[PDB]
Amino acid sequence: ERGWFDILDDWLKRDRFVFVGWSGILLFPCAYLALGGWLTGTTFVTSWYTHGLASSYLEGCNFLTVAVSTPANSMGHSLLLLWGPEAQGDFTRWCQLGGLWTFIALHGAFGLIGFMLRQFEIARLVGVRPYNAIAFSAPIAVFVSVFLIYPLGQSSWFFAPSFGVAAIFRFLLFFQGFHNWTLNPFHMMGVAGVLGGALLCAIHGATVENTLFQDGEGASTFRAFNPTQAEETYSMVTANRFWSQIFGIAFSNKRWLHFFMLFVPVTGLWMSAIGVVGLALNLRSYDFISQEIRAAEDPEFETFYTKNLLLNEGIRAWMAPQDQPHENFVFPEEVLPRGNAL
Amino acid sequence: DWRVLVVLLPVLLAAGWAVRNILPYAVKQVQKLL
Amino acid sequence: METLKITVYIVVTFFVLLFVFGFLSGDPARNPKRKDLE
Amino acid sequence: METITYVFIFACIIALFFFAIFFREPPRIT
Amino acid sequence: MEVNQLGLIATALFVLVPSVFLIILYVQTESQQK
Amino acid sequence: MEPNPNRQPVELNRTSLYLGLLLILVLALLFSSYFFN
Amino acid sequence: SEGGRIPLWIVATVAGMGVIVIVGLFFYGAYAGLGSSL
Amino acid sequence: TTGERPFSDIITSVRYWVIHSITIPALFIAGWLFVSTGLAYDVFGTPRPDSYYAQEQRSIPLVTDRFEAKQQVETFLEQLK
Amino acid sequence: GLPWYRVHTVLINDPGRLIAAHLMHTALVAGWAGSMALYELATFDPSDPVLNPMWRQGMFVLPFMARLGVTGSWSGWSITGETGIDPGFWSFEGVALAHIVLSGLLFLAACWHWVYWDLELFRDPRTGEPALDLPKMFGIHLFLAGLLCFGFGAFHLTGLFGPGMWVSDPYGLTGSVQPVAPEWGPDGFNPYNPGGVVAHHIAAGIVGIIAGLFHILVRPPQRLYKALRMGNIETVLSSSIAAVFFAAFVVAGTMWYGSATTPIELFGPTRYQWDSSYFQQEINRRVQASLASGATLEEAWSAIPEKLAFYDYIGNNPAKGGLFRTGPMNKGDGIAQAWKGHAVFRNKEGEELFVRRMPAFFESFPVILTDKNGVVKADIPFRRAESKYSFEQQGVTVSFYGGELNGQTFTDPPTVKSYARKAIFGEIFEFDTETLNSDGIFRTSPRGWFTFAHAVFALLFFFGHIWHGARTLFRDVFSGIDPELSPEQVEWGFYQKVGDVTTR
Amino acid sequence: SYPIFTVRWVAVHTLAVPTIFFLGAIAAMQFIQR
Amino acid sequence: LGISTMAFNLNGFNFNHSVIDAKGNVINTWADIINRANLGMEVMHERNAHNFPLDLA
Amino acid sequence: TITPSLKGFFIGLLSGAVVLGLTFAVLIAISQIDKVQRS
Amino acid sequence: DIDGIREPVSGSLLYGNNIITGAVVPSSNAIGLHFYPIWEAASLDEWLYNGGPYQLI
Amino acid sequence: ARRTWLGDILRPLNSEYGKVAPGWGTTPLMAVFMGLFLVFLLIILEIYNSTLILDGVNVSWKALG
Ligand code: CLA
Ligand code: CLA
Ligand code: CLA
Ligand code: CLA
Ligand SMILES: CCCCCCCCCCCCCCCC(=O)OC[C@H](COP(=O)(O)OC[C@@H](O)CO)OC(=O)CCCCCCCCCCCCCCC
Ligand SMILES: CC1=C(/C=C/C(C)=C/C=C/C(C)=C/C=C/C=C(C)/C=C/C=C(C)/C=C/C2=C(C)CCCC2(C)C)C(C)(C)CCC1
Ligand SMILES: CC1=C(/C=C/C(C)=C/C=C/C(C)=C/C=C/C=C(C)/C=C/C=C(C)/C=C/C2=C(C)CCCC2(C)C)C(C)(C)CCC1
Ligand SMILES: CCCCCCCCCCCCO[C@@H]1O[C@H](CO)[C@@H](O[C@H]2O[C@H](CO)[C@@H](O)[C@H](O)[C@H]2O)[C@H](O)[C@H]1O
Ligand SMILES: CCCCCCCS[C@@H]1O[C@H](CO)[C@@H](O)[C@H](O)[C@H]1O
Ligand SMILES: CCCCCCCS[C@@H]1O[C@H](CO)[C@@H](O)[C@H](O)[C@H]1O
Ligand SMILES: CCCCCCCS[C@@H]1O[C@H](CO)[C@@H](O)[C@H](O)[C@H]1O
Ligand code: OEX
Ligand SMILES: [Ca+2]
Ligand SMILES: [Ca+2]
Ligand SMILES: [Cl-]
Ligand SMILES: [Cl-]
Ligand SMILES: [Fe+2]
Ligand SMILES: [Mg+2]
């Protein structure tokens, strides 16, 4: 049974500098086009016709302000294929209509599929359990919820995040003003998972590094480890006593410790994704009804919650006309919300 | 488009120059694989 | 308020004194190995 | 009723801290 | 304040049901032969 | 009736009880404001 | 031909200097012409 | 190791630099000319500094129809006289 | 022993008890459907399908019953507003009852299958070990599914032997259950064409019967059998979960954008209908046709059905709710009683003015009035000291045409401003906020809630797919890797092909 | 002894070739004036 | 250190109107949209506490 | 009738097929030329 | 009165807050960087109005 | 194990566990159907998306009255 399929299989799995695999057929072109689209757009391509913004090095933007911006709102959720009815095979017009945005979003999505398939394929060849791919499910849930489902729930791709540093910052602030996203318990669980994950990373690294066995003569202690050694390189018993006495509880089981290091940031990201699916539909955690009833009836009742809402109102009114140009907003000065003096 | 020739010309002379220096070993590498 | 202030000053002073005289009570020698560090 | 609920959950948490520290299963070197 | 009147029982059962689940499993683990 | 050979005992250790209770209680402390609204 | 003739430390130094020069040019460009606010 | 020549071998060899002292500057020059000849503008459809607005216009050329979007961009372009 | 999250694994090699657990799940779901229909019937007010239809009342299963032809109650009412209809047994009540009884029978069957788990049927004749022939089972089940799908299409949906399905006009004014013929041309693939739903069930039914027979008669290729681990039931779990998350994303999507199977009279209008002023454009068209036929303004507007005006109101837009704002739409803006009529704003010069509508993004929005050419003519100012467009300065008035306020004109600034504030929501209605103690804050419809639940569940089921596919393909290493793993297997270059010991 | 044109060679160049081109383009941009 | 240096009002990069066309029209970038959002926050915060036009702490 | 978008659809389908086919032809060829050594 | 403009902000559960909205509120802008321990107040009622708990904590 | 009337009737339908056709069998045929199905999904998606627009096919509520 040595046919062309098995010969190709042989070639794909050669132990070379950069592993290819069957998954590589999907992963490499898609990742390359996604990165290339971004670099190409941020270097050369405008957002004048879609947003009324300069967005490239060519126009005078810097690394923080370049972006590949979303298509105009009038495009709706068009796949905006180069050979599609909008661009009609015209490359220049396609760039001007925002086709690079969907090019990057879609190729990027298939690329992420490719990467997770790669994690599976390599795990299988080497003979380890596939927890790395499993953990990668969280980046996938995030990308899919934020870059696809969220704008699919809204009016058009226009309201997806645009691919750029400052553009992303704008996405954050928009979510605050319009969605009150910081109030959302799903976002909050996300925050707990990210910061808790960072905390675990730091504390675990530092603990290992500070309960090392002296396994060599050098004052720089990195050389006193050998990959093939059977022995733990640090003392779990000392680590355990230290933390039990410092913080009251400590890990005692290394397998549980490492699983927990998977569980915390992965679960956090998954929760954030769920909340974003809600925001796709404007199904927000925007208000507490009891708060609003009390506040509406009682002009002396004030909390940090009501204060934050006044900030959000400011954001919406002052950012909307330029951020949502298709609405043709004209807000006369006299209607703009402002406190005293400012 | 003259601009296209003006831009691609550097790359073309680059390619052709690299072929000149590496062709003897390229033919050896390929004639070895076969 | 004055009684509260005197009280609090006394408490703070007490604990600060414990900290200082404590770390002065042969602290380098309070380790599991090489003690003679004078 | 709300305030009672919040304070109650909090109180249960502090109690849990107490049990988890002082009445944990002791780690044993096998 | 005009809170939601189901919030109290929602919260109580939210806590009670899974906690009781865990307590049941814990106690019967302990009672298994040592 | 003959016994089923697929039965297995179940366990939850004390640490897992504590982690579970912390999760549920913290989840309640978090979601309760939204349940009361 | 054979690897070794051009010492790696010199290669790293020259490459690094090049990197510094180009990034320097980009920072100059922040103050002149497009994107300069002027 | 996986069979390919070590990078440190390659980039410290005379031959590598005989090739790349030509190929690397050539690419850099090509990219320069891509901008300096103005080709980039035309390829990607990016406005030159004098092409964002007509002389007296102050309204953005926003695309407002999905299926005639191309023609709209062409019209915007025509409007720069 | 087993950790809490693995308790159910005792079923993997016990087909009888697995069937019992499935019977019990099915019993619980059927029971849920019964209970939900009963609760909805105990709370649904059938007295006004125009301004209080099911989607305003938080009805979730009622529209699914209605969609396939169950429209009446044993009590005499129907969801279309008829009286003196006899629905036969298959009223909403009859469906609920049927689901309860089903639930009961399934529960009893579960008990039987749990006690008598050791059936010879479940043993492989050659080894005596528990075994299910999954490929042939797939054929059997696919064949069955095919016959059912085809039957549903050819008999139920067509009305050949069945009631048909809910269909309506493009503005959701005259909806009813009708027999629907299959559409065999390309328009069958148009989501908004019901004939395509019919045609789909016929054609896909047939294809299911054929593929079913294939899968019954033809064994899997050895290479696919091995690759997909067809001897392991968890492979089936993996792929079934995949199919299921796909189906869930599709129903979330068709619920959000609308299609022939998600009609607005059953689930509420879509957000995109507000976005594009779909109903407003139709209303203006009708009013213009009336004017051109020689009607007065009052007559023109009085000729607009309340239902249509009601669609042109943001309170019915599914994209205006909140995650923890619970219950029926009626609990927010109130129970709608009547259209107030169309508000026309004019300034002291008699120029007509138009209030700028609220886009869905905005919890709050200013009040700004422009002429027909978008020039600002009046507004409600925040800072007063340099105001130039106040209703007072500009002499803004408002006159109503159609509805309860028809023929009336208001000139006092407070009233005019109040109506302008309502005008940001589209057409203006009178609401009962007292019956339900409404709090005046917008809530989404069943279109919204369904979409949310199903997009979320689909996303979670993706994780389910990844987990179970992984467990399937890595079964041999799930308690850990080989203690004797040779270092050379992960050492670069040693093997030509990664992890292939024959390629040293 | 060692081959020249490998999978690795290809990957390396698909990244490095456009990078140097892009850097030349961005360099020229620094002298553009409104 | 970001918080601790912004404490002394050495702030984030400011590219408000950094991009300008041949006549001198401002060509907005994403930095300017950020600026509009920041303005909303600024003009609304502590709505009764400022009597003079600049918020200087 | 073939609309410009159905024609476009055909063009995209053909392009995809061409990319995929060329890719697999090349990979198969290289796999055939450079076989793994086994005992 | 966090901002020293006699505009008291409610932070506690018993005064209309939930877990999410609740806070111990920063000390008064009238105080600035002045040290405001309990014994600097004429009374606990004063101490509380001006945000003393914040500094203590 | 327990025999029953119905189990005896159904026995043959659960008696071929593990039975396989040699080698690749009908995989090529399966591949083709998979390819057709991918194109079918791309068609219906692009129609719903208005990227594919066909005469007589109005993807809108105003499809048929
Ligand atoms: C191999 C990995 C890969 C994958 C998964 C994708 C995926 C995608 N590409 Mg990308 N692309 C790739 C490599 C890839 N590309 C490469 C190598 C290039 C350089 C040439 C590109 C250049 C490119 C451009 C310029 C564009 C895309 C676009 C797309 C999107 C639309 C694709 C489509 O509709 O195909 C349709 C075709 C198929 C799905 C082929 C299926 C094969 C069938 C089953 C075989 C049968 C064919 C049949 C017999 C032929 C009959 C034809 C006849 C009637 C004329 C999609 C996300 C578009 C996009 O992103 O828009 C925003 C777009 O504009 N790609
Ligand atoms: C000529 C006969 C005929 C006719 C007229 C129809 C008509 C229809 N078919 Mg049916 N069909 C038929 C025969 C027919 N079929 C046959 C013989 C089969 C094989 C058994 C099928 C198998 C089939 C499937 C699998 C589907 C249909 C669907 C439909 C409906 C399409 C309109 C729609 O709402 O798409 C909406 C659906 C899509 C546009 C598909 C989207 C595909 C996604 C995007 C792929 C990616 C999935 C992935 C998880 C996405 C994640 C990313 C995202 C979250 C961002 C329409 C009623 C679709 C349907 O049920 O709609 C409700 C559908 O999914 N048919
Ligand atoms: C697909 C599921 C689904 C959907 C979409 C609906 C939709 C609806 N229901 Mg129905 N219902 C359902 C299933 C569903 N129901 C089930 C299973 C029951 C039995 C309990 C009911 C019983 C029911 C009643 C009694 C009522 C409704 C009503 C309604 C309407 C108002 C919805 C609402 O206010 O939700 C509010 C939604 C939320 C507040 C979201 C809660 C989200 C949870 C708390 C997240 C939890 C996070 C988790 C713990 C984190 C874990 C972390 C860990 C993994 C690390 C709406 C039409 C109401 C109505 O108007 O009837 C006429 C009404 O009175 N439903
Ligand atoms: C058809 C769907 C389906 C089926 C039949 C299974 C079946 C199984 N799963 Mg899988 N899984 C699924 C989907 C499914 N899963 C999905 C969607 C996810 C992502 C959420 C997972 C993620 C997952 C993980 C991480 C694990 C499993 C495991 C298992 C095995 C043991 C489960 C157990 O004992 O839990 C016992 C559960 C309890 C004792 C209490 C659970 C309480 C839940 C979390 C909260 C309340 C749930 C509520 C009642 C559900 C309402 C219905 C819902 C649709 C709204 C069992 C074979 C385990 C395994 O592989 O063992 C080897 C395992 O570790 N599953
Ligand atoms: C010399 C540079 C130091 C930089 C600042 C300190 C960095 C490391 C401190 C982290 C503490 C983590 C918790 C304890 C972690 C811990 O316990 O460390 C232990 C680890 C190993 O300890 P050893 O005892 O083997 O060696 C330390 C001494 O004993 C000398 O041998 O210490 C180091 O590796 C020191 C590394 C110095 C060189 C590190 C440079 C890294 C940063 C370089 C600058 C990057 C800035 C980027 C900005 C854009
Ligand atoms: C889109 C598209 C496409 C593609 C294209 C491509 C593929 C491209 C690529 C491209 C590329 C691939 C590019 C690249 C670039 C690069 C660059 C531009 C770089 C830069 C760098 C730098 C600047 C650096 C910096 C730094 C850092 C990062 C850190 C360290 C320090 C320093 C500062 C030095 C095609 C044709 C298919 C089709 C159509 C569309
Ligand atoms: C035995 C019998 C009988 C009876 C039966 C019955 C009576 C039944 C009932 C049944 C029932 C009555 C059932 C029920 C069920 C239910 C369910 C199953 C539910 C569930 C739920 C859930 C699961 C939920 C969840 C949730 C929550 C809670 C919150 C939000 C979120 C969610 C949705 C997740 C008869 C006489 C007929 C005959 C035969 C015998
Ligand atoms: C403002 C705060 C006051 C600051 C005063 C600082 C003045 C500097 C001198 C302080 C006096 C130091 O006095 C210091 O404390 C105690 C007093 O018995 C001594 O005694 C200590 O000796 C040994 C040392 O191994 C300890 O183990 C033992 O517990 C303790 O008795 C220290 O050996 C002595 O060095
Ligand atoms: C579960 C108890 C069974 C009670 C059965 C009552 C049948 S009721 C009967 O049903 C016919 C078909 O629906 C109708 O044609 C007829 O009008 C109706 O009265
Ligand atoms: C299990 C006991 C439930 C029996 C209920 C039988 C309802 S039967 C039902 O009764 C209606 C009378 O209003 C008729 O309109 C309808 O035609 C008839 O089928
Ligand atoms: C003093 C106000 C005079 C104008 C009447 C207000 C606009 S209309 C008004 O809106 C209310 C919601 O706010 C509804 O509950 C009520 O039914 C309706 O009359
Ligand atoms: O305090 Mn808190 O916030 Ca810092 O700026 Mn100034 O003051 Mn008030 O205003 Mn902006
Ligand atoms: Ca009231
Ligand atoms: Ca100039
Ligand atoms: Cl504030
Ligand atoms: Cl001031
Ligand atoms: Fe570790
Ligand atoms: Mg510059």
Side-chain angles (χ1 to χ4, degrees), chain I residues 186-378:
Chain I
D187 201 36
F189 301 102
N190 183 346
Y192 297 99
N193 194 339
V197 173
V198 183
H200 163 92
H201 288 89
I202 294 174
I206 285 163
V207 167
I209 298 167
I210 299 178
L213 290 170
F214 167 81
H215 278 289
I216 286 171
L217 299 175
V218 178
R219 300 307 299 182
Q222 198 255 196
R223 308 198 62 148
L224 295 182
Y225 188 101
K226 288 172 89 332
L228 284 178
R229 318 288 200 275
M230 295 189 198
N232 181 358
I233 187 177
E234 203 163 6
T235 201
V236 185
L237 186 49
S238 172
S239 41
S240 296
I241 289 177
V244 165
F245 80 68
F246 171 37
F249 275 125
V250 171
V251 294
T254 66
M255 185 61 69
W256 200 241
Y257 304 119
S259 75
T261 79
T262 66
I264 70 182
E265 289 164 286
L266 305 187
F267 297 101
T270 73
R271 70 153 287 151
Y272 301 98
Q273 288 171 318
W274 178 254
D275 289 335
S276 67
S277 304
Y278 181 71
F279 298 103
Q280 185 188 47
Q281 286 178 82
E282 176 65 4
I283 288 158
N284 290 336
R285 183 195 69 79
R286 288 178 68 132
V287 167
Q288 294 306 139
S290 278
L291 288 173
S293 80
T296 69
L297 207 41
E298 295 196 9
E299 288 171 332
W301 284 101
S302 292
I304 300 288
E306 284 204 330
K307 202 179 182 175
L308 181 64
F310 198 46
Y311 283 136
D312 195 22
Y313 162 60
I314 218 185
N316 298 329
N317 177 344
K320 282 291 309 172
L323 181 55
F324 297 102
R325 300 175 183 170
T326 59
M329 281 173 134
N330 291 157
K331 172 66 193 186
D333 49 3
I335 307 169
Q337 305 292 299
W339 185 35
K340 296 213 174 189
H342 185 73
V344 174
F345 299 85
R346 308 184 176 91
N347 62 16
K348 62 175 63 181
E349 291 87 358
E351 321 175 43
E352 192 181 0
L353 303 183
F354 308 89
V355 183
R356 181 51 165 92
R357 282 182 173 193
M358 168 189 265
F361 258 136
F362 293 77
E363 290 291 337
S364 67
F365 196 74
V367 177
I368 306 171
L369 279 65
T370 61
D371 58 23
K372 76 196 179 205
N373 291 325
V375 182
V376 177
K377 295 303 220 183

Side-chain angles (χ1 to χ4, degrees), chain A residues 1 5-6 9-10 13-17 19 77 116 119-131 133-134 137 140-141 144-145 149-156 159 174 178-179 184-186 255 266 270-271 273-274 277-278 280-287 289 292-293 313 316-317 320 324 326-342, chain I residues 6 222-223 229 249 256-257 271-272 275 318-326 356-357 359-368 374 376 379-384 386-390 393 439 441 443-444 448-449 451-452 455-456 459-460 462-463 466-467 469-471 473-482 485 487 489-500 503:
Chain A
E1 316 168 16
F5 178 92
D6 302 311
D9 183 83
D10 284 340
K13 296 165 167 161
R14 291 290 279 278
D15 205 23
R16 45 170 73 95
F17 192 96
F19 183 81
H77 308 95
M116 197 170 165
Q119 291 165 314
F120 279 119
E121 184 166 26
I122 297 176
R124 190 64 270 192
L125 292 165
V126 159
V128 301
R129 315 154 91 204
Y131 288 80
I134 293 164
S137 75
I140 300 230
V144 164
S145 63
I149 298 178
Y150 176 79
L152 282 168
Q154 297 288 337
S155 68
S156 69
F159 294 101
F174 183 96
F178 291 83
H179 296 305
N184 199 297
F186 290 97
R255 299 188 163 200
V266 170
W270 269 96
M271 296 303 97
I274 292 178
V277 177
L281 310 171
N282 290 332
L283 209 41
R284 304 146 178 180
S285 293
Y286 193 90
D287 48 9
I289 298 186
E292 304 291 7
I293 293 172
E313 289 147 31
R316 298 195 290 270
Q324 308 181 37
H326 55 277
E327 300 278 6
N328 294 314
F329 286 138
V330 174
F331 293 165
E333 280 197 48
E334 68 194 65
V335 312
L336 292 175
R338 306 177 74 164
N340 205 49
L342 305 183
Chain I
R6 291 188 193 158
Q222 198 255 196
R223 308 198 62 148
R229 318 288 200 275
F249 275 125
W256 200 241
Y257 304 119
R271 70 153 287 151
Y272 301 98
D275 289 335
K320 282 291 309 172
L323 181 55
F324 297 102
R325 300 175 183 170
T326 59
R356 181 51 165 92
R357 282 182 173 193
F361 258 136
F362 293 77
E363 290 291 337
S364 67
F365 196 74
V367 177
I368 306 171
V376 177
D379 60 34
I380 302 181
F382 198 93
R383 279 176 176 178
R384 319 308 213 261
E386 293 174 1
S387 179
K388 52 178 156 184
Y389 296 111
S390 68
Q393 282 160 307
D439 52 33
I441 305 179
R443 288 162 171 71
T444 192
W449 282 117
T451 301
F452 174 65
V456 168
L459 199 60
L460 294 172
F462 169 72
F463 186 91
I466 291 320
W467 176 257
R471 288 232 333 142
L473 294 169
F474 293 77
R475 192 188 193 175
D476 63 346
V477 293
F478 253 91
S479 295
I481 74 186
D482 171 33
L485 188 52
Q489 185 186 145
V490 302
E491 247 57 275
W492 284 264
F494 196 85
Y495 296 148
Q496 287 169 85
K497 182 180 172 178
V498 178
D500 186 346
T503 71

Side-chain angles (χ1 to χ4, degrees), chain A residues 307 311, chain K residues 45-46:
Chain A
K307 286 165 61 63
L311 307 181
Chain K
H45 84 299
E46 309 162 350

Side-chain angles (χ1 to χ4, degrees), chain M:
Chain M
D1 183 26
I2 181 175
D3 297 323
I5 48 166
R6 316 306 171 77
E7 193 195 286
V9 173
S10 183
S12 74
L13 297 177
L14 286 170
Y15 285 73
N17 285 277
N18 60 37
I19 287 289
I20 307 302
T21 74
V24 178
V25 182
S27 54
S28 172
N29 197 50
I31 284 169
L33 296 178
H34 286 241
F35 190 61
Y36 189 62
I38 294 183
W39 58 86
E40 270 297 303
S43 71
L44 283 167
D45 290 322
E46 181 209 300
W47 183 70
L48 291 171
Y49 180 98
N50 288 270
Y54 184 79
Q55 288 198 11
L56 186 149
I57 299 161

Side-chain angles (χ1 to χ4, degrees), chain A residues 15-17 40 44-46 48-52 58-59 72 74-75 78 86-87 90-93 95-97 325-326, chain H residues 2 4 7 34-35 40-47 52-53 60-67 69-70 73-74 76-77:
Chain A
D15 205 23
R16 45 170 73 95
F17 192 96
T40 296
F44 295 111
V45 177
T46 194
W48 193 234
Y49 305 101
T50 60
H51 289 251
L58 180 55
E59 295 167 286
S74 62
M75 311 309 307
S78 179
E86 303 92 3
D90 189 311
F91 176 85
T92 297
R93 296 289 174 261
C95 293
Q96 297 166 322
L97 292 175
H326 55 277
Chain H
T2 43
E4 314 88 350
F7 282 114
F34 188 58
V35 168
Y41 289 114
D42 295 345
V43 166
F44 299 99
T46 301
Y52 283 89
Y53 295 101
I60 310 294
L62 200 70
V63 167
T64 61
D65 172 73
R66 171 165 175 184
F67 304 105
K70 185 169 179 288
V73 172
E74 270 127 31
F76 294 142
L77 289 173

Side-chain angles (χ1 to χ4, degrees), chain A residues 243-317:
Chain A
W243 288 111
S244 294
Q245 299 181 280
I246 289 301
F247 189 61
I249 62 155
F251 288 107
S252 63
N253 190 295
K254 285 192 187 194
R255 299 188 163 200
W256 164 244
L257 189 160
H258 291 84
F259 175 79
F260 190 66
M261 290 181 70
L262 185 158
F263 179 87
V264 169
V266 170
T267 300
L269 260 66
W270 269 96
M271 296 303 97
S272 67
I274 292 178
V276 168
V277 177
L279 301 194
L281 310 171
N282 290 332
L283 209 41
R284 304 146 178 180
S285 293
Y286 193 90
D287 48 9
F288 292 117
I289 298 186
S290 62
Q291 286 282 305
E292 304 291 7
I293 293 172
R294 168 69 180 284
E297 289 160 355
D298 175 7
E300 287 169 341
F301 180 71
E302 186 169 34
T303 69
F304 279 106
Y305 158 88
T306 62
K307 286 165 61 63
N308 292 340
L309 298 194
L310 289 155
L311 307 181
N312 293 348
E313 289 147 31
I315 294 167
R316 298 195 290 270

